[PDB]
């Protein structure tokens, strides 16, 4: 397979699952990815793209304006080997997630194409310019030359975009290959630039794409992210140290774990740092929701739609860990006293929801042990709906306890 230019030949195709490993070399290269030493590499240069994901469009016009999905716009990258990642996963560079126009997150699948560039595309001989169009308002432009350093200088490709401060890297000119281009070895004498000025009539056509703006809330953008409100935690009780091992075994007795303890003993912060550690160590995806917010709990159908949404989302991503805060408000037995249990019918409104959830998840879990797990939080093991225990949905368990004076002081 030789492409539209005889300079380029196509070698092999694979699909791989995106993960985070926090290895990058921004002072050297950006538009690059790293692949396991077990995934023996046919070529260090290639093309990649997100495998687009969105809901079925199960309703006419999807109830919203956008008519058709934007194409993949696949980007060429360098590929470099490392042992530090598990098989078939990919480390995707920080300045590449933003090009793929979604927050950096272990999750969606990547396309990977392996490529040959022939001697027809070696150093020099096409001293091409590139437009650096400003896609949003900025200081009166800095020099184009500095971008040859600050983009690392490793690689480029036509029609590149960088939303971090909204610049477009694009060229469409004769006497250039208009493809993947080398840059790492190339002298700055062999390249030119246009720091092309602002213009609404140009940018508004690009803004017709899917643009769920990533930093729409004011935080000084990616330039400074003036929005931190979090920290580490004081490692008081080792509960983290047990659970993070357990919940990441190759296989588990049942899909569910329950976490309980006295009000204010610190469920929430602990869950946040369990999330963060799981999100950093072993490539598990998370989706997280609060019983306060999904106020559909007055109705069945839309709530059912939410549960099927979470199920589907999980099953399309990699291994994932669903976590729920104060589950009693969603699935708890609605009267703590049994009372008259609706003339002993016992099926009050709530339990239906939980039954549908357990049925769906069980159907998933019988397929493959990793595909989903769930982590409840509540006040007391025995106060949540016994039907949760009846079906043997949960087994292993932990409780937090009043921290012992020694660690308590070390916390203080």
């Amino acid at each position: 397979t030789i492409l539209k230019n005889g300079a380029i030949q196509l070698l092999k195709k694979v699909i791989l699952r995106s993960t985070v490993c926090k290895m990058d070399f921004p002072k050297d290269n950006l538009f690059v990815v790293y692949i396991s030493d077990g995934a023996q590499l046919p070529s260090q240069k290639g093309y990649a793209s997100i495998v687009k994901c969105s809901l079925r469009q199960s309703k006419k016009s999807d109830s919203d304006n956008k008519s058709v999905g934007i194409p993949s716009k696949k980007i060429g990258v360098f590929i470099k080997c490392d042992s530090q990642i598990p098989e078939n996963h990919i480390a995707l560079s920080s300045h590449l997630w933003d090009a793929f126009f979604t927050h950096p997150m272990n999750g969606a699948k990547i396309k990977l194409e392996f490529l040959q560039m022939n001697q027809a595309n070696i150093i020099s001989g096409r001293n091409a310019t590139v437009n650096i169009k400003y896609f949003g308002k900025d200081v009166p432009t800095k020099s184009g030359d500095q971008y040859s350093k600050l983009l690392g200088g490793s690689l480029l490709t036509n029609n590149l975009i960088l939303p971090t401060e909204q610049i477009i890297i694009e060229i469409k000119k004769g006497e250039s290959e208009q493809q993947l281009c080398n840059l790492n070895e190339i002298s700055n004498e062999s390249v030119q630039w246009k720091v092309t000025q602002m213009g609404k009539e140009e940018v508004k056509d690009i803004i017709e794409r899917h643009l769920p703006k990533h930093y729409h809330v004011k935080e000084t953008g990616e330039v400074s992210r003036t929005s931190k409100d979090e920290d580490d935690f004081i490692t008081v009780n080792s509960i983290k140290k047990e659970m993070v091992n357990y919940l990441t075994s190759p296989i588990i007795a049942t899909p569910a774990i329950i976490l309980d303890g006295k009000q204010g003993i610190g469920k929430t912060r602990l869950l946040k740092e369990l999330i963060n550690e799981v999100e950093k160590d072993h490539h598990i995806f998370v989706k997280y929701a609060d019983c306060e917010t999904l106020h559909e709990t007055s109705n069945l159908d839309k709530t059912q739609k939410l549960i099927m949404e979470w199920c589907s989302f999980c099953y399309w991503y990699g291994p994932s860990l669903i976590v729920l805060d104060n589950v009693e408000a969603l699935f708890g037995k609605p009267q703590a006293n049994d009372g008259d249990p609706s003339n002993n019918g016992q099926w009050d409104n709530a339990s239906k929801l939980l039954n549908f959830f357990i049925n769906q998840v069980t159907k998933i879990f019988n397929k493959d042990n990793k595909r989903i797990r769930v982590l409840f939080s509540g006040k007391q093991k025995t106060q949540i709906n016994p039907l949760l225990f009846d079906k043997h949905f949960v087994s292993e368990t932990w409780s937090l306890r009043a921290p012992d004076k020694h660690a308590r002081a070390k916390l203080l």
């Binding site: 994901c53 069945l300 099927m308 949404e309 087994s395």
Partner: protein, 1030 residues
């Protein structure tokens, strides 16, 4: 490593000869003999269990190619063999050593083994006789040396390993039953009967559904055509004396008016298949009826299969899988997934299978407006979950006049058709086994005998399949119920459906509705089930409609029956019943198949119409054997996992043990047990792998693990549904009670564990009460005797039967027998029974609630469970005379447990002998003199108080020591340090832990408090004179 593989006639201890190149990757001076990892890929979905062999270099083999001895695979090379292995070299060449070695030999040779008069003489002769090498021999259980010789029975701590010829168990076993004569290495004794070479056709060979799908790689021929062979059938070399033509790659069958042409190929020795049958892919068996086909014919006309079909015709087969918009989108795109790379090869009216992943419903499968080359890569990431049949509607064509006998679709041709639905019978499980090919969550294969009610239900349905020839519409229906949840009703019906070859429709009433019974909503409930029924049933199949958990919809309200509540439900149940009748009138058969939990509250106005009322039990001990067999079956554990290590049980387990230790458990508990075991096994595996050393390349399961899990499960049951504070004490600690505890314990032992004397209709000592003074422990002995036979346990903690609501407070009484009946081998204990037992002749005042609860309770515990034998009830109260009348036969307790004061000096010593054991006893003076010193007026609580005082005083003495040492150390410092900063952080056992001496007992022996005055004992014995002196 995907090493190339070759086989040799060489024997079970001939070496492997390894490839001359790969020796550079493995051969090194560290090992005197090489040992390598043998994993020949067998037919199967799972990987290969690990084997290990003695190895040598081969000087001659082609690159990356290996010779193996055939004998370890249970065959000689009489037929062609697989040409690759997943071989691996072993780091440091290390091998485990067996503790157990065993060998089964026929009686005649065994006589020679006995004629060898000593173990060392036996070893010396026989190892040389068998050409074995000392230490250098490595073997497996289920190695068979030769026919009639050396079946390897059991090995430990591994199933395979090295033998220490100096110190291993080399166990003689005599094959007194000649079982070895049943063993064979596949070798034929003679040429097979009547070869038919040169005949155009052959007969008397069957067809047989595959146990699983087989890869593109496992067939030796693999011609490069992108789509040519999907039907991919195969047969062993027997075909070569049936088909004379060179094992030709495609052959044809016709019977019953059909046409089939089938791609047919060889089969290899590494196999479990039987002779003389075509092993049949699903698409083959679906095209034939359930009637057998036993015929084959040679033809070359494949070139006449028309390479252009200018149009394409098809239809979906009807089924519940087709009715829903929330599936139609995936089904419609599955059309594309099908016809892409499904170049047709076959006659019209064919049944092509296709399958999909039901999770995918809400997902963009990322092909529309993506194109390029991704779709089969996602198809490599997915795996399917449910399967639908497509019917090959006859094409109407103009490229050729021949249209019916066979045609080829090519996706370069743009047509399809969607003629709504066609109706066709679904295949019977006994022939098809269809589930196991596509690997879905298999239904449990019931047998037709051992769960007799299943035979009842499946016959009840079969009535209406069979009566279809008699033309009568039988209108058969059934209504399943159980006294407890989790009995698998739905799965059992599913089984029946697949076994009989009959469609099934399923809807779950916990799911079906946007709301429960409510105002202005009966239409919103009932129309939904009406619509979803109408969408399929009158179109296609035998009529089978399954409704789960109907009690959600069909309910009856006795009280709180206000109009705005009652009128809706009361309309609802009829408004359904009329629809049920309408379905039974309009459609053929209309087999309603209901299910419910608590049967009592099904609407009688509905249930009267129903008929068979099958009650499905909790599984007996004889049943659950089959349950465990299923879940421990290799199929059920070597799936949902994906790491290459396989899992198995091993021969130390025996289902009998679990059958002894498992009862009162549902199938869900059994599954949870087995998976808890699998979790423990994998955890043990990886944790050991963290240490360098010998461990198996497979994960193994133990009886002690299973037992521990069973205890865990029974605890989880007791915590969720049973009582808190389960039976949890050593009977060893209830000292001093004598033949009184003898008669008690025997009275509760014998009906529990010698049932042949007790499996009878007469009364059998169902209840006991206790009336000793306080301070002799009744409450302890109750939980202890419960622990002695693992009785189910419920404690009435006194007055909690009472409640505010006159007219409902008695409900806790019915509850007691509800929970007892739910926990058949149970002990029910009313502690402080006086709290609900005044004088039965109470008062001439009002008949207040205190009388109405107790008399009703006594009457019901006299009048019920007296027939439903099994329960036991216990009561204790330290004051006899208030339980005056219920000591007569109508109160039935009738048992004289004056569990009172001790009577003998040794027995009172036996108290402290049973009690003190948990701390360190002094014996520098002997115990008996304490009993001699005691006035004969004390009880176990008193002897407890004495030992407690003594040991606490000794703790105060060691405290008064170490506090002095701390004070001295403080004076040796700033006298101001934190009390933690020395003796505690040093954790000095010597200065802190248990010490005692008998002089602290003798000093504590005076200061007790005998609050049971002798006047009290005298009064109680005076009552005993008429309660018990008889």
């Amino acid at each position: 490593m995907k090493a190339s593989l070759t086989f040799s006639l060489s024997g079970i201890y001939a070496p492997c000869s390894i490839s001359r190149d790969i020796y550079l990757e493995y051969g090194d001076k560290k090992a005197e003999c090489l040992y390598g990892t043998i994993r020949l890929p067998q037919y199967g979905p799972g990987c290969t269990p690990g084997k290990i062999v003695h190895c040598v270099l081969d000087d001659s083999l082609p690159f990356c190619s290996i010779v193996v001895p055939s004998k370890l695979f249970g065959f000689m090379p009489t037929q062609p063999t697989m040409d690759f292995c997943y071989f691996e070299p072993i780091l440091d060449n290390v091998v485990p050593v067996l503790d157990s070695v065993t060998f089964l030999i026929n009686e005649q040779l065994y006589s020679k083994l006995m004629d060898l008069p000593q173990e060392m003489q036996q070893i010396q002769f026989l190892h040389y006789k068998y050409n074995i090498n000392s230490m250098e021999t490595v073997v497996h259980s289920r190695d068979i040396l030769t026919s009639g010789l050396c079946q390897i029975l059991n090995c430990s701590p591994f199933p395979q390993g090295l033998v220490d010829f100096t110190e291993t168990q080399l166990i003689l076993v005599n094959d007194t039953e000649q079982k070895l004569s049943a063993l064979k290495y596949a070798n034929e004794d003679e040429e097979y009967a009547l070869p038919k070479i040169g005949t155009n056709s052959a007969l008397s060979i069957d067809l047989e559904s595959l146990p699983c799908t087989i890869s593109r790689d496992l067939l030796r021929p693999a011609p490069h055509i992108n789509d040519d062979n999907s039907i991919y059938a195969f047969t062993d070399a027997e075909t070569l004396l049936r088909l004379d033509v060179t094992s030709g790659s495609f052959i044809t069958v016709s019977n019953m008016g059909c046409v089939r042409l089938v791609k047919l190929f060889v089969l290899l020795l590494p196999n479990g298949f039987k002779k003389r049958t075509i092993y049949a892919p699903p698409k083959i068996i679906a095209s034939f009826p359930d009637c057998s086909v036993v015929t084959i014919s040679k033809s070359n006309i494949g070139h006449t299969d028309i390479p252009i079909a200018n149009q394409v015709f098809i239809s979906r087969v009807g089924g519940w899988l087709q009715s829903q918009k929330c599936f139609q989108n995936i089904i419609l795109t599955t059309l594309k997934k099908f016809f892409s790379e499904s170049k047709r090869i076959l006659c019209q009216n064919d049944l092509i299978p296709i399958a999909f992943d039901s999770s995918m419903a809400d997902l963009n499968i990322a092909e529309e407006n993506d194109e390029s080359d991704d779709e089969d890569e996602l198809g490599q990431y997915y795996k399917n979950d449910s399967l639908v049949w497509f019917f090959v509607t006859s094409a109407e064509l103009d490229c050729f006049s021949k249209d019916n006998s066979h045609f080829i679709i090519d996706p370069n041709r743009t047509k399809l058709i969607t003629t709504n639905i066609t109706n066709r019978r679904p295949l019977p499980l006994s022939r098809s086994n269809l589930q196991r090919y596509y690997g879905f969550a298999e239904t449990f294969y019931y047998d037709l005998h051992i769960f007799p009610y299943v035979r009842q239900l499946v016959n009840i349905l079969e009535t209406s399949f069979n009566c279809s020839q008699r033309g009568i519409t039988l209108n058969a229906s059934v209504l399943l119920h159980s006294t407890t949840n989790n009995v698998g009703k739905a799965t059992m019906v599913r089984f029946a459906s697949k076994y009989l070859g009959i469609h099934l429709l399923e809807i779950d009433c916990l799911s079906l509705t946007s709301n429960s019974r409510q105002l202005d909503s009966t239409s919103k409930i009932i129309g939904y089930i009406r619509a979803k029924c109408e969408n399929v049933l009158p179109y296609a199949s035998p009529a089978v409609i399954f409704l789960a958990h109907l009690d959600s919809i069909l309910l009856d309200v006795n009280a709180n029956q206000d109009p705005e509540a009652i009128k809706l439900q009361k309309s609802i149940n009829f408004e359904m019943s009329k629809l049920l009748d309408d379905f039974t009138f309009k459609f053929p058969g209309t087999t309603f198949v209901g299910s419910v939990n608590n049967i009592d509250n099904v609407p009688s106005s509905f249930r009267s119409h129903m008929r068979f009322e099958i009650l499905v039990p909790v599984p007996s001990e004889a049943q659950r054997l089959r349950i465990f067999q299923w879940y421990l079956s290799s199929h059920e554990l070597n799936r949902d996992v994906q790491q290459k290590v396989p899992v198995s049980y091993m021969d130390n387990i025996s289902f009998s043990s679990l059958s002894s230790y498992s009862a009162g458990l549902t199938p869900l508990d059994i599954k949870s047990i087995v998976e808890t075991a699998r979790m423990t096994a994998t955890a043990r595996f990886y944790q050991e792998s963290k240490k360098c050393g010998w461990l198996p390349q497979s994960i193994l399961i133990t009886q002690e693990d299973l037992s521990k899990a069973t205890s865990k499960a029974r605890n989880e049951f007791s915590v969720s549904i049973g009582a808190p504070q389960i039976p949890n004490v050593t009977w060893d600690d209830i000292g001093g009670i004598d033949f009184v505890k003898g008669e008690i314990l025997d009275t509760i032992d014998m009906p529990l564990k010698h049932p042949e004397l007790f499996t009878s209709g007469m009364k059998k000592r169902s209840g006991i009460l206790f009336y000793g003074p306080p301070g002799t422990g009744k409450t302890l002995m109750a939980k202890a005797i419960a622990t002695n036979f693992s009785l189910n346990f419920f404690s009435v903690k006194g007055p909690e039967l009472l409640n505010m609501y006159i007219g409902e407070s008695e409900a806790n009484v019915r509850r007691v027998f509800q929970k007892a009946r739910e926990a058949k081998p149970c002990v029910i204990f009313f502690d402080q029974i006086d709290s609900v037992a005044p004088k039965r002749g109470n008062q001439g005042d009002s008949g207040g609630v205190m009388d109405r609860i107790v008399s009703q309770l006594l009457a019901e515990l006299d009048g019920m469970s007296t027939d439903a034998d099994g329960v036991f009830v216990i009561g204790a109260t330290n004051r006899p005379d208030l339980l005056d009348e219920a000591l007569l036969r109508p109160g039935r307790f009738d048992k004289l447990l004056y569990l009172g004061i001790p009577d003998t000096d040794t027995k009172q010593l036996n108290i402290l002998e049973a009690l003190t054991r948990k701390f360190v006893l002094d014996n520098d003076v002997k115990l008996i003199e304490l009993a001699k010193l005691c006035p004969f007026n004390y009880t176990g609580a008193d002897f407890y108080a004495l030992c407690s005082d003594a040991m606490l005083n000794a703790m105060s003495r060691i405290a008064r020591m170490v506090e002095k040492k701390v004070s001295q150390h403080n004076e040796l410092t700033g006298e101001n340090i934190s009390t933690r900063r020395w003796f505690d952080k040093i954790a000095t056992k010597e200065d802190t832990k248990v010490v005692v001496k008998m002089e602290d007992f003798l000093k504590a022996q005076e200061q007790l408090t005998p609050s049971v005055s002798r006047a009290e004992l005298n009064h109680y014995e005076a009552v005993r004179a008429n309660f018990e002196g008889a």
